Amino acid sequence: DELQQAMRLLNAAS
Amino acid sequence: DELQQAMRLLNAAS
Amino acid sequence: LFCEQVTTVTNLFEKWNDCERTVVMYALLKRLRYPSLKFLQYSIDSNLTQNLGTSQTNLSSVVIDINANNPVYLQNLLNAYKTARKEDILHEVLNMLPLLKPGNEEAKLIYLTLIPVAVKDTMQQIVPTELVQQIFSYLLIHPAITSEDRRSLNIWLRHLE
Amino acid sequence: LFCEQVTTVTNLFEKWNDCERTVVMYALLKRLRYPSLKFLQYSIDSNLTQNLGTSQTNLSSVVIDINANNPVYLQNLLNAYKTARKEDILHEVLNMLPLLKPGNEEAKLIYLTLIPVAVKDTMQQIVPTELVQQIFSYLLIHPAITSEDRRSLNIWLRHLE
Known part of the structure; x- marks a missing residue:
């Protein structure tokens, strides 16, 4: 899901 | 103030 | 993390x-x-x-949405609560209250006429107290409910706390 | 509790x-x-x-709110990015993107024209990686971005995953 994809990027960025 | 009032009523029911 | x-x-x-x-x-x-x-x-x-x-x-x-903002639907429901089906009608009110549109005075009036009856019913154990506590919770933070409305409802809140 | x-x-x-x-x-x-x-x-x-x-x-x-939806302002920030102040400009893009209104195609296009340049610059490490990922996060769930826009952007997401 695009929302899951977004949480992964936000995960990496933390 | 009404927000905390509500949080209490919801926690009372908890 | x-x-x-x-x-x-x-x-x-x-x-x-x-x-x-x-x-x-x-x-x-x-x-x-x-x-x-x-x-x-x-x-x-x-x-x-x-x-x-x-x-x-x-x-x-x-x-x-229409039901929660239609004074005709809401009045007919208040007339049926007084009599019976209180718990089911109170559940319907809790489900509908969040959809009360700011500015809908006709509808707001009926909601505020039922809340007193329901607090009195919870004190005589006719209806579950949890439901009324959830209704008052929405009422306390509701964009459609004014500061005046809240002060007029304060007498019934004390009993719920 | x-x-x-x-x-x-x-x-x-x-x-x-x-x-x-x-x-x-x-x-x-x-x-x-x-x-x-x-x-x-x-x-x-x-x-x-x-x-x-x-x-x-x-x-x-x-x-x-206005800047984020102003094609003239956004075009000028794009023009200013290619040259310098890329980091600062991307912070501004990250703060304005949430305000992009669904249906504002003129502004959306400028936005979707900078992300590719921002992606290429992260792969040369001209600009921080977290900022472009933050911007991409919004683009993936943004109510203004279409599935068609997201397809054209997947070619750039992989480089960030």
Whole structure:
């Protein structure tokens, strides 16, 4: 899901 | 103030 | 760490009923800045169009909205509560209250005529106290409910606390 | 108890940045039913009115809202990025993107014209990796971005995953 994809990027960025 | 009032009523029911 | 913090929050949320979810979401919005509120406004306008575009939830959503703002539906429900079906009617009121549109005075008046009767009924144990506590919770933070309305309802809140 | 699971969620929330908070708030809105979404729509409206009625935020909110949807302003920031101040310009793009209004094609195009350049610059390490991931996070869940736009952008997401 695009929302899951977004949480992964936000995960990496933390 | 009404927000905390509500949080209490919801926690009372908890 | 982030995906984990989010999985914690998400779980605690799904362990919450709709009233607890709505009240908490209301409080978290007060910790957001303007650009975020606008994004969520446009986001809900997609999720709302989404619900009203799929049979699964379209009709139910359209109906509860009109019913919650239709003085004719609400008056007819108040006339039936007094008599009986109090718990089911109170559940219907709790399900409909969040949809009360700011500015709908006719509808607001009927909601505020029923709340007193229901607090008195909870004191005589005719109706579950949890339901009335959830109704008053929405009433305390409701955009459609004024400061005056709240002061006039304060006498019934003391008993609920 | 509730006030204890609510306090846990509020604590992790205040440990999040504005992008992180807004993305999670979008996720939580998906775990809600129509009445709750409508209640929050009215609540965001009240919060937005309050934010625009105080000097601590009014001018800051009006200008960012207009700038984010102004094709002339955005084209000039793009023109300014290619040359320098890339980092600063991307922070500004990250703060304005949440305000992009669904249907504003003129502005959306300029936005989708900078992300590729920003992606290429992260792969040469001209600009920070987290900023472009934050911007991409919004683009994936943005109510203004179409599935067709997301397809054209996947060629750039892989480089960031």
